[PDB]
Ligand binder design. Structure first.
Ligand SMILES: Nc1nc2c(ncn2[C@@H]2O[C@H](COP(=O)(O)OP(=O)(O)OP(=O)(O)O)[C@@H](O)[C@H]2O)c(=O)[nH]1
Ligand SMILES: Nc1ncnc2c1ncn2[C@@H]1O[C@H](COP(=O)(O)OP(=O)(O)CP(=O)(O)O)[C@@H](O)[C@H]1O
Ligand SMILES: Nc1nc2c(ncn2[C@@H]2O[C@H](COP(=O)(O)OP(=O)(O)O)[C@@H](O)[C@H]2O)c(=O)[nH]1
Ligand SMILES: Cc1ncsc1C(=O)N1CCNC(=O)C1
Ligand SMILES: [Ca+2]
Ligand SMILES: [Ca+2]
Ligand SMILES: [Ca+2]
Ligand SMILES: [Mg+2]
Ligand SMILES: [Mg+2]
Ligand SMILES: [Mg+2]
Lengths: 425, 438, 352, 54
């Protein structure tokens, strides 16, 4: 009984969080009403990691939905599995955040955060042993970014010895709602450097290029991008939601992946990624070749531009675990220059016999590369291009912020980039 | 008769303890319910098997064991397994959340909050003892509990039982089965704080057991069950003398006397033969000379190294099955004229031999084939220091960048204990060189 | 795509192998500290053998046999010949030798003096040579007092062996020489002799009445190119190869190099390597080893071959670097790591 | 090749063959260590809360 508390904030956070619970709810045999209807006991072995058990053998996701406007969450409550979420766990306001970090962090968010923490505290008090929390959210908006990182700052205050993980969607000019996204991302990234143990960096540009080039989608939508995230999110949490020789919680997984407290921003990856030749069998060497291919990376960073501090792969399905070992050792041996030699055996692998829906076998990738610094450089440049003219700052100063807070967040991120750079040499 | 208390710390120690007591029960003819028909003295007795088992008025034979894990999922298998009736609840101690492969977490943070409960449950077994010899501590090096909590337990056992002996069965880290990158840190941290508290330690390299399983047993990807049934064979061969009538290694003090002339160098190498797959059509039963010769092949050692380039300080031959001294000497003489067996000038060039006529018992359905004779050699070679060098080297690579150090400090450990423990290993590696090289 | 690493920058032999392996487009060199290597061109001293063969999925091969220093050390070779039954103390192809520890430090001081006095009394040739592994420092003397006193002035172990007073002398020149044979032992412990040896001849006429001037007594290539005034006179760089040394033996002594010398050499190579084969064989080890050796022989006027020393990290002759290095890659490296003749070696078969 | 101290019984025998002759911290000091580390954990956690308060 090692429970995880899930929190999804903002439009992006809640739309992705919804699909995530839809994806794993199917994997665990839970139906839209919360009633189990599977065929294996492995589906219920670790079902309490993400689901609470109510009367009548009902399973209610341990999830807390948060937003400053009701729009997105109303949809969730009307979506496929909308009924599966605890009603009292929908916490929302009416003002909105206007894609403004300051509104989410200082003003509108502040007015609503205490009420969210009351639900969080209510979900924790019922945990036999809380592993930690996980937050899904974008960094380019106002609620998920501004209030999300505010929630993290308060959850750490009340639970300082619990693991905090986040799935963070990074903004890209190619998939942009507003021009202030670099502002909101730079401000949030500093919060995440301080108050999270692991951050799954999901670059919306990478999610777009994959939908366009690889998946051959002429015009990608936010739903198409979220399908990738739903599949990847289900991939990394596989070892957490199913049994195996793993025996790994959030703290033990963080220990093996985070050599330094601030360098905990991971590149995700999924395989296969096929367009509609979709019935072909995928061989273990193929899974491994693709899973390490930059084209399958979702952080829009070329790993060959840096070095892996650590790596973790999670294979799913009935496959040759001997052939898996052989292929994992093949990638490291044929490219050992791209793995730091001052951390021996920094590539770990886990297996799960239960594959995703409609996939004989799959592989989920978790890379802690120093090449992630390229991601923070994009945001930093876009940030500076506007802040040098103080463009669009009036939205933020109007909520009480000072240019100094910007100059500091700018420095903190440029520090973070220099820290990755020193370990790349 | 004098009792021996077994302590299994962590996932590695508990699962290995489970495999051993399963085997102990098959050998001594004890059923999963604790009943032993051959035992004629009901609810009492001071037989050789009573050093590992106590008795109840109801004829139940209860292991003198204690399982300790900082998370309950592994010990819960014992509570509901085939041999769930052997142990009573007091014997199985479990926490809520483990040490996350963090030595400082198992030794300090979580260790401090449970050590007293452990020593209490251990004191309950000690009170059932008329003359306690000491403890057998099964634990891993890389695990956060295995390394961290064990060293604290060892420090306290040397306090509450200053006169008792303590032997270790320690699982060396192997990347082919480990999922922890910081195991070099933990291993060295626990050797440092445990060295002076352990009188004899048998290191089992998971790498060795892995190849012995793939080579001799034809297991493509061996699991923990495969690795453990094999390790409980070697453990049985080592503890057989304490559980059966004999005169070699009859109490825990004898292991130190016969195997460790210098206290710090108390890590004997173990070599076992033969390991024969049960799926074989039918194997040509090996002779005394054949299995005794294999005791000097690196591919049968629990720690891969090359004794040819070290110096022996002692050497035991534990035979089981159809073996007589005449055949032993014949093979020994033949091996001295074909093998490089250099002893230290301040120690005799000899072999203490022990023979038990009961051949190795094999778990029904397991992977090992029943053989007519088997041997396990306990030699104290300077060549095992190769394992420290490997480990020490990896420690130096990460610690040069202070990689992962922040996890330990955050649990209350000081960064200096790292270099303090790493200097001790530097001294340990030097002694081995002082005694082995010219 | 096999991977290797280089830890001995001063090795000219393997510097060419690393150069040849790369030229195959199938071998990739790594940093000298990257442990994910197929092959290690290891360092000479304190090579970390204990850290080999523990890399899952990598078949690892090193170019040094752990324990082969027993044969490549002056004091170690003597101890190995006298104490090994396969070689016995009555070994007929090795000069009578003794290990002498300086008095400022078992020791064979009195044993050497016993045989010495026997030769002094029996009017026999009593000229010995004192040398050690710590030499670039050699002293050829006929008085035991000078030999023992020369070693006490040093601090390292030395060896005194009978100096060959009747060495075979090439004509014209009346000069000394020694023969160098390269022997490659692969992971299977096959003993391959390089068909191409070299004679490092002295350009100074041998003078048995003046051991002070050690220029006509020591055939080292560095001594003849520094203290010898006839360097490069008879043969280019004081180096005669087998073809010429064979033709000379035919014209002068009416015999062949194969019959009068090569059989004794191959017999000596086999005897030494097979002797320590149990102590250094990597047949059942978690890593494989191969190593190139350089045997130095002496030939007396009776055409008897004597073993001088064994070189564990020998260098080659400038002309033969190409042929030999390609041979190391063919039978030593590609035999274990194949790439996607008329051998240049003479396989000395034997019982394993 | 000498055998010595041969012992025999019903379940086996044991002997010795010679091929050649030759040529702590108190309970107090442990409680202090465990408490010194808990104090560094409290000091660290206090600097965090002090940080979160600012
Ligand atoms: N031979 C063998 N090794 C094991 C077994 N279980 C775990 N290990 C090894 O033990 C090491 C990890 O230590 P664990 O015992 O699992 O960790 P722990 O002692 O439970 O401590 P925690 O960090 O709190 O979980 C790895 O090197 C594993 O390969 C086992 O059953 N047999
Ligand atoms: N017992 C002996 N009788 C005759 N000559 C001898 C001798 N011992 C040494 N020499 C001479 O010394 C030379 C080689 O010396 P030695 O090989 O012992 O020193 P070294 O090892 O530093 C040279 P290298 O290792 O390059 O062959 C030979 O040319 C030989 O003529
Ligand atoms: N992948 C993905 N990204 C989204 C989605 N919705 C918004 N985003 C991204 O998130 C940023 C906008 O943040 P948003 O969630 O709408 O602001 P918020 O509602 O105040 O938290 C932009 O960079 C968008 O590209 C979504 O459904 N999927
Ligand atoms: C680090 C991590 N964080 C969230 S999930 C996750 C993971 O799935 N693994 C796979 C198993 N072994 C690991 O070390 C990490
Ligand atoms: Ca308001
Ligand atoms: Ca009884
Ligand atoms: Ca003690
Ligand atoms: Mg929006
Ligand atoms: Mg554990
Ligand atoms: Mg030399």
């Amino acid at each position: 009984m090692r429970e995880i508390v899930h929190i999804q904030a903002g439009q992006c956070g809640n739309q992705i969080g919804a699909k995530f619970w839809e994806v794993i709810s199917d994997e665990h045999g839970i139906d839209p009403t919360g009633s189990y209807h599977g065929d294996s006991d492995l589906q219920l072995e670790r079902i309490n990691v993400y689901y609470n058990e109510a009367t009548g053998n009902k399973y209610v996701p341990r999830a807390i939905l948060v937003d400053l406007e009701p729009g997105t969450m109303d949809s969730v409550r009307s979506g496929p599995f909308g009924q599966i979420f605890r009603p009292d766990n929908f916490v929302f306001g009416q003002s909105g955040a206007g894609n403004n970090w300051a509104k989410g962090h200082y003003t509108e968010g502040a007015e609503l955060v205490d009420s969210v923490l009351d639900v969080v505290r209510k979900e924790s008090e019922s945990c036999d042993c809380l592993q930690g929390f996980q937050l899904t959210h974008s960094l380019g908006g106002g609620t998920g970014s501004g209030m999300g990182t505010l929630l993290i700052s308060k959850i750490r205050e009340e639970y300082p010895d619990r693991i905090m993980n986040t799935f963070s969607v990074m903004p890209s000019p190619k998939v942009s709602d507003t021009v202030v996204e670099p502002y909101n991302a730079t401000l949030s990234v500093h919060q995440l450097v301080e108050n999270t143990d692991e951050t799954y960096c999901i670059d919306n540009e990478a999610l777009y290029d994959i939908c366009f080039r690889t998946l051959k989608l002429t015009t990608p939508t936010y739903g198409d991008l979220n399908h990738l995230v739903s599949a990847t999110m289900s991939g990394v949490t596989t070892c957490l939601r199913f049994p195996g020789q793993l025996n790994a919680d959030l703290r033990k997984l963080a220990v093996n992946m985070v050599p330094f407290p601030r360098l905990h921003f991971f590149m995700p990856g999924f395989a296969p990624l096929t367009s509609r030749q979709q019935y072909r069998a995928l061989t273990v060497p193929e899974l491994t070749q693709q899973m390490f291919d930059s084209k399958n990376m979702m952080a829009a960073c070329d790993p060959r531009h840096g070095r892996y501090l650590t790596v973790a792969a999670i294979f799913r399905g009935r496959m040759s675990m001997k052939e898996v070992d052989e292929q994992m050792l093949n990638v490291q041996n044929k490219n050992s220059s791209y793995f730091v030699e001052w951390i021996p055996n920094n590539v770990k692998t886990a297996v799960c016999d239960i594959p995703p829906r409609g996939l004989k076998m799959s592989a989920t990738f978790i890379g802690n590369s120093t090449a992630i610094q390229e991601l923070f450089k994009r945001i930093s440049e876009q940030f500076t291009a506007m802040f040098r003219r103080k463009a669009f700052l009036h939205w933020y100063t109007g909520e009480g912020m000072d240019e100094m807070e910007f100059t500091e967040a700018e420095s903190n991120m440029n520090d973070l980039v220099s820290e990755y750079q020193q370990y790349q040499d | 008769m004098r009792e021996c208390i077994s302590i299994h710390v962590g996932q590695a120690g508990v699962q290995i303890g489970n495999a051993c007591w399963e085997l102990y029960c098959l050998e001594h003819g004890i059923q999963p319910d604790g009943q032993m028909p051959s035992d004629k003295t009901i609810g009492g007795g001071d037989d050789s098997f009573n050093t590992f088992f106590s008795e109840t008025g109801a004829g139940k034979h209860v292991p003198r064991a204690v399982f300790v894990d900082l998370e309950p999922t592994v010990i819960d298998e014992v509570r509901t397994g085939t041999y769930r009736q052997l142990f009573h609840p007091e014997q199985l101690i479990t926490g809520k959340e483990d040490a996350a492969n963090n030595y400082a977490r198992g030794h300090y943070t979580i260790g401090k909050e449970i050590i007293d409960l452990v020593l209490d449950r251990i004191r309950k077994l000690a009170d059932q003892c008329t003359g306690l010899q000491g403890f057998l501590v099964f634990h891993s090096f890389g695990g956060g509990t295995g390394s961290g909590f064990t060293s604290l337990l060892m420090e306290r056992l040397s306090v509450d039982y200053g006169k008792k002996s303590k032997l270790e069965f320690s699982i060396y880290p192997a990347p082919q089965v480990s999922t922890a990158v910081v195991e070099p840190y933990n291993s060295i941290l626990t050797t440092h704080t445990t060295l002076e508290h352990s009188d004899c330690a048998f290191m089992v390299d998971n790498e060795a057991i892995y190849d012995i399983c793939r080579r001799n047993l034809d297991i493509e990807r061996p699991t923990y069950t495969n690795l453990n049934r094999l390790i409980s064979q070697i453990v049985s061969s080592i503890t057989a003398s304490l559980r059966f009538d004999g005169a070699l290694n009859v109490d825990l003090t004898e292991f130190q006397t016969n195997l460790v002339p210098y206290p710090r160098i108390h890590f004997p190498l173990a070599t076992y033969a033969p390991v024969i797959s049960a799926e074989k059509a039918y194997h040509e039963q090996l002779s005394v000379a054949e299995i005794t010769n294999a005791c000097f092949e690196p591919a049968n050692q629990m720690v891969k190294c090359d004794p040819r380039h070290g110096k022996y300080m002692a050497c035991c031959l534990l035979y089981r099955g159809d073996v007589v001294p005449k055949d032993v000497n014949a093979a020994i003489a033949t091996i001295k004229t074909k093998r490089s067996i250099q002893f230290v000038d301040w120690c005799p060039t000899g072999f203490k031999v022990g023979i038990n006529y009961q051949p190795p018992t094999v778990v029904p359905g397991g992977d090992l084939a029943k053989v007519q004779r088997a041997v396990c050699m306990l030699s104290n070679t300077t060549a095992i220091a190769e394992a420290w060098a490997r480990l020490d080297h990896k420690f130096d690579l990460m610690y040069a960048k202070r990689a992962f150090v922040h996890w330990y400090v955050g649990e209350g450990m000081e960064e200096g204990e790292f270099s303090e423990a790493r200097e001790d290993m530097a001294a340990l590696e030097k002694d081995y060189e002082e005694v082995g090289v010219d | 795509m096999y991977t290797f690493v280089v830890r001995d920058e001063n090795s000219s032999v393997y510097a060419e192998v690393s150069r040849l392996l790369l030229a195959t487009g199938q071998w990739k060199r790594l940093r000298k500290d990257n442990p994910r290597f197929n092959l290690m061109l290891g360092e000479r001293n304190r090579l970390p053998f204990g850290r080999l063969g523990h890399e899952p999925g990598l078949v690892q091969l090193v170019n040094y046999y752990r324990g082969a220093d027993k044969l490549c050390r002056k004091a170690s070779l003597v101890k190995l010949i006298k104490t090994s039954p396969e070689l016995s103390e009555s070994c007929t192809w090795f000069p009578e030798s003794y290990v002498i520890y300086p008095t400022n430090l078992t020791d064979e001081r009195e044993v050497f003096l016993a045989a010495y006095n026997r030769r002094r009394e029996g009017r026999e040739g009593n000229v010995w040579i004192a040398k050690s592994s710590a030499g670039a420092g050699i002293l050829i003397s006929s008085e035991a007092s000078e030999l023992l006193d020369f070693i006490d002035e040093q601090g390292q172990v030395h060896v005194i062996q009978k100096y060959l007073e009747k060495p075979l002398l090439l004509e014209p020149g009346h000069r000394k020489f020694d023969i160098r044979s390269w022997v490659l032992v692969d992971h299977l412990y096959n003993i391959y002799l390089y068909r191409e040896g070299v004679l490092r001849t002295s350009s100074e006429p041998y003078n048995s009445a003046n051991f002070q001037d050690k220029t006509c007594h020591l055939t080292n290539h560095c001594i003849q190119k520094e203290y010898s005034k006839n360097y490069g006179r008879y043969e280019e760089g004081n180096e005669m190869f087998f073809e010429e040394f064979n033709q000379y033996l035919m014209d002068a002594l009416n015999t062949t190099l194969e019959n009068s010398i090569l059989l004794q050499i191959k017999h000596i190579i086999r005897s030494c390597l097979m002797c320590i084969e149990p102590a250094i064989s990597t047949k059942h080890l978690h890593y494989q080893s191969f190593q190139l050796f350089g045997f130095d022989f002496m030939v007396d006027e009776e055409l008897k071959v004597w073993l001088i020393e064994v070189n564990g990290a020998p260098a080659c002759a400038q002309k033969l670097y190409a042929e030999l290095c390609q041979g190391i890659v063919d039978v030593a490296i590609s035999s274990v790591f194949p790439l996607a003749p008329t051998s240049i070696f003479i396989k000395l078969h034997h019982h394993h | 090749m000498e055998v010595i101290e041969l012992n025999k019984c019903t379940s086996g025998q044991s002997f010795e063959v010679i091929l050649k002759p030759p040529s702590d911290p108190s309970l107090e000091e442990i409680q202090k260590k465990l408490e010194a580390a808990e104090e560094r954990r409290k000091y660290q956690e206090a600097e965090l809360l002090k940080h979160l308060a600012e």
